[PDB]
Design a protein around this nucleic acid. Structure first.
Ligand code: MG
Ligand code: MG
Ligand code: MG
Ligand code: MG
Ligand code: MG
Ligand code: MG
Ligand code: MG
Ligand code: MG
Ligand code: MG
Ligand code: MG
Ligand code: MG
Ligand code: MG
Ligand code: MG
Ligand code: MG
Ligand code: MG
Ligand code: MG
Ligand code: MG
Ligand code: MG
Ligand code: MG
Ligand code: MG
Ligand code: MG
Ligand code: MG
Ligand code: MG
Ligand code: MG
Ligand code: MG
Ligand code: MG
Ligand code: MG
Ligand code: MG
Ligand code: MG
Ligand code: MG
Ligand code: MG
Ligand code: MG
Ligand code: MG
Ligand code: MG
Ligand code: MG
Ligand code: MG
Ligand code: MG
Ligand code: MG
Ligand code: MG
Ligand code: MG
Ligand code: MG
Ligand code: MG
Ligand code: MG
Ligand code: MG
Ligand code: MG
Ligand code: MG
Ligand code: MG
Ligand code: MG
Ligand code: MG
Ligand code: MG
Ligand code: MG
Ligand code: MG
Ligand code: MG
Lengths: 60, 103, 77, 92, 44
RNA sequence: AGUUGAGAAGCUUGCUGGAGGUAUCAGAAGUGCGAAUGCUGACAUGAGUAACGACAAUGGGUGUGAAAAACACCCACGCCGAAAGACCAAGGGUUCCUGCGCAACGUUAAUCGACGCAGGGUUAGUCGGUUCCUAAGGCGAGGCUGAAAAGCGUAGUCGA
RNA sequence: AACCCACUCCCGUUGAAAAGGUAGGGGAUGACUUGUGGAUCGGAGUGAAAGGCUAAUCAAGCUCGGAGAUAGCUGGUUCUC
RNA sequence: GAGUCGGCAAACAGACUUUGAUCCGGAGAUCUCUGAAUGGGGGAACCCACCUAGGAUAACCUAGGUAUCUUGUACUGAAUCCAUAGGUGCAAGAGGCGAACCAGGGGAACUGAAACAUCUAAGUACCCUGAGGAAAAGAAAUCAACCGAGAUUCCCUUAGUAGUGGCGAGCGAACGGGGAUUAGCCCUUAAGCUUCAUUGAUUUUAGCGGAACGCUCUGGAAAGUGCGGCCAUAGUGGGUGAUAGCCCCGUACGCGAAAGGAUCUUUGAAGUGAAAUCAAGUAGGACGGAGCACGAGAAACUUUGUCUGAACAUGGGGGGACCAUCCUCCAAGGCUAAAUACUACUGACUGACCGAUAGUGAACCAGUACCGUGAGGGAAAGGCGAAAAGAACCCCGGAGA
């Protein structure tokens, strides 16, 4: 959520967090190109989660 | 807010099957209601491809309009209009014949 | 365009009436020639095209006064 | 950037001409981003698969156009890159 | 049997293109008039 | 269909139709069509008539298939060969290739297709572009000229 | 001969073609033919001059406005007594 | 406040959450390349870059900047001794678009006159330039006859009248009455208008509650036939399987705002109005033109292209050639609300308006398809049922139609 990310999570702590779920976005774009992805809710979920951490890095 | 939620039990006014005591399963968005047990329909459906089957004639319920049912009272055992005459922290659905809150 | 830098005269239009009133258009241009005017404070000639009615005003008001309010309407001299 | 490595690759492109290509040779066909250069996908393979690649070729594909009622329809055009690796380290 | 239309693309864009119409003053009135009717194209 | 009035027209009923209708008397009219070489859709006569797009030419077999003069393979005849063959530039815009089909299209039939649906398919330091420089010509800071729009043009920067 | 042009006959005229075809013709190293790119426009251009050409339109294009131009001239003008 | 993942569109998958999930309003963050397009160029949605700081490995990346003009401002300094032009650096503003409205610049012809030149059409169409939510115009060198009226703008009369006119076609006032609206201030420096700081009111961008019915017939289905009763500051609304004040949404009424938006008003501030100082190349005059209803006409008056030229309140200029006598105003410097004109866009209503050859060109994926090198032109296209219950299964057929 967003109330978690406000809670004393600094610039570098959330700045490392973006490079974590870009991996999870990459691995879900590789499995979709191949034939193994049934959890289609996961694919449209990390798009709405990279957007949250980019918002809190402009409001302090 | 709306007179009829999902987990209610109703009776039917002015239909093919009037006076049938029922219970709401699914509410649609064009204020049509699928009441569990009444308004039965039968659909000639082809048996399904892609290693499925449907076979033949299978029943299900067809929805009816929201103006054709009403909240059942179980204290005069007849249909009763409902209202929101009582609200203190929430709009409580309350009957108008007896001024008693529904459950 | 044919305007003056002192008096503000543009060309106007009118007619060219004959002896049977055959109206046709013409332009009334103003007289204006180039001329150099000596100043003393900047001790140099300035050249600007003015009318013959602008020559009469320079001879009346003075050159330094008419150059001043030419600057004080925001123009190039 | 720290980003921009997790954007230029959109998956494999396995088909009849790419299956026989990766076996007789070592060339793997990806479906790269719509505007990427030959350097910034040389780096995103050495990073994301830990293999050394010698050289990369690319090409552009036009989208096929359908013609039904109520106008025409243009499918999305896309780029494509043949990644020619070393004779060892066939990738996954 | 030369017909009156022999096609090209370098001659079509330099005469009827957008940067040809937008350069002059009549052509910028051709753009606003053809836009305000509601045409999809504005540049043939 | 019957029946009543000098007439415009009115009235009662048989079937089809499946939800609106207007005594009476007054108003307000986009108020009555056969014709304007009238306008826009439908259907006739001509008429199952003329034509089926160069007078390079086709004849058997085997196959597939619901169905072969026209499709595939085979055998034999013909025709172009300074093109009816190959290749670059324009121009076009997926017509290229493979499965699946044949209602529509193709001046006939189609199992065939430049035709429908679904996949596939264009790899560059050197070949053409872009980058460098210019011809005719275009635009042109400042600058002159002009009712206003604007016109011409120096430095300059575009244009094979 | 390629190539550019259009002198004759016949066929065609609802053509294969809103200007061709099959046979014959004239020029063919030059007042030549042609590819790409540019310049000149509406009482205005171009023209070895015919009033010819300026997008199958030309004794002054095409399009939108003035404009429902003006017509002592043709054609039409609808239910009963 | 309990369902949800936009529409044509429709299935089968994967899912999210009792209170903030979709959903509705206020504020913010992101905002690719084109386009005034503005770092330089271009064939609009493309190419080539510099500079400053911060990182990064023979190949770069984040963050900014970099257009011309108009003003101002420091620095620099040609022929030339000085010092102007000129050249840099910075600050502020402008540029473009939009249907009509308003003021200016330029301005036709067809057609009327039963021909046609003056004249009409007409200062109309169109084309440029400005500015505003309105603009312009306005505070007497004005009109009236010896009576008096006191800024402008707009409607109704005077009146199709006096005049004007190849005295033809035609064009056409004023004086005086009736109404709408109601402020006059300054050049000794003013109201007023801007822009912030302010204290209250007024609404505005979302909502919430919201009265009263039963049995009985026919029918596929009752709102209808019957028989009764109730509500009312809500009774000719919509829609529910056929005709509903009382079934559903609404209506008459009542309440509603974290937050912005304005509109009146608070009392302060910074400004500005603003030109300095009662008006000189100004009034008037002479040829040449316009505007005045007024086509040189006995032609007054206002204007300006050329040429000239005064008096200084014992002055001046007006009262339709001109002159004497009377009356009435102070020209050559400025500022001003209201009544007024308009609708591309909004919302609420309303109709003796249309009902798919009508009404927008357009109820339908319409400025689309198509026709053009272009500017430009420009169509045809609605309806199953209350509800998809949209036809399982069998027989002929190419395994189709
Ligand atoms: Mg005239
Ligand atoms: Mg390449
Ligand atoms: Mg697209
Ligand atoms: Mg009805
Ligand atoms: Mg009629
Ligand atoms: Mg008829
Ligand atoms: Mg007749
Ligand atoms: Mg026929
Ligand atoms: Mg015959
Ligand atoms: Mg015969
Ligand atoms: Mg025959
Ligand atoms: Mg043939
Ligand atoms: Mg031979
Ligand atoms: Mg030969
Ligand atoms: Mg195709
Ligand atoms: Mg093929
Ligand atoms: Mg056929
Ligand atoms: Mg095909
Ligand atoms: Mg160059
Ligand atoms: Mg040049
Ligand atoms: Mg210039
Ligand atoms: Mg030039
Ligand atoms: Mg040739
Ligand atoms: Mg020859
Ligand atoms: Mg010879
Ligand atoms: Mg002749
Ligand atoms: Mg022609
Ligand atoms: Mg007219
Ligand atoms: Mg006519
Ligand atoms: Mg530029
Ligand atoms: Mg630029
Ligand atoms: Mg502007
Ligand atoms: Mg005439
Ligand atoms: Mg005339
Ligand atoms: Mg008349
Ligand atoms: Mg006449
Ligand atoms: Mg004003
Ligand atoms: Mg004023
Ligand atoms: Mg008096
Ligand atoms: Mg007064
Ligand atoms: Mg409510
Ligand atoms: Mg209610
Ligand atoms: Mg009703
Ligand atoms: Mg019905
Ligand atoms: Mg009702
Ligand atoms: Mg009921
Ligand atoms: Mg004065
Ligand atoms: Mg005078
Ligand atoms: Mg005077
Ligand atoms: Mg006088
Ligand atoms: Mg007098
Ligand atoms: Mg219509
Ligand atoms: Mg109909």
């Amino acid at each position: 959520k967003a109330n978690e990310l406000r809670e004393e999570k600094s610039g570098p702590v959330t700045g490392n967090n973006i490079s974590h779920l870009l991996r999870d976005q990459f691995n879900l774009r590789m499995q979709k190109a191949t034939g193994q992805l049934g959890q289609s809710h996961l694919l449209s979920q990390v798009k709405r989660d990279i957007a949250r951490v980019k918002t809190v890095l402009n409001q302090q | 807010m709306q007179k009829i939620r999902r987990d209610d039990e109703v009776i039917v006014i002015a239909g093919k099957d009037k006076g049938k005591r029922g219970k709401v399963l699914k509410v649609l968005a064009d204020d049509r209601l699928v009441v569990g047990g009444v308004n039965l329909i039968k659909r000639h459906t082809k048996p399904n491809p892609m290693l499925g089957q449907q076979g033949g004639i299978v029943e299900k319920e067809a929805p009816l309009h929201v103006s054709n049912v009403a909240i059942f009272n179980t204290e005069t055992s007849k249909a009763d209009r409902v209202g929101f005459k009582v609200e203190d922290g929430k709009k409580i659905r309350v009957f108008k014949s007896t001024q008693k809150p529904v459950q | 365009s044919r305007v003056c830098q002192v008096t503000g005269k543009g060309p106007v239009t009118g007619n060219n009436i004959s002896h049977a009133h055959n109206k046709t258009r013409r332009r009334f241009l103003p007289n204006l020639q180039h001329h150099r005017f000596w100043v003393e404070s900047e001790k140099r000639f300035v050249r600007l095209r003015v009318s013959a009615k602008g020559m009469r005003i320079i001879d009346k008001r003075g050159i330094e006064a008419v150059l001043a309010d030419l600057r004080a309407r925001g123009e190039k001299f | 950037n720290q980003e921009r490595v997790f954007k230029v690759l959109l998956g494999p492109h396995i088909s009849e001409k790419a299956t026989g290509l990766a076996d007789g040779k070592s060339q793997f066909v990806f479906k790269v981003a719509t505007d990427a250069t030959k350097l910034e996908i040389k780096k995103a393979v050495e990073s994301l698969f830990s293999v050394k690649v010698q050289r990369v070729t690319t090409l552009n594909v036009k989208g096929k156009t359908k013609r039904t009622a109520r106008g025409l329809g243009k499918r999305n055009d896309w780029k494509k890159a043949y990644i020619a690796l070393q004779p060892g380290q066939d990738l996954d | 049997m030369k017909r009156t239309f022999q096609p090209s693309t370098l001659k079509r864009a330099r005469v009827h293109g957008f940067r040809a119409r937008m350069a002059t003053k009549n052509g910028r009135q051709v753009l606003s008039r053809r836009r305000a009717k509601g045409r999809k194209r504005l540049t043939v």
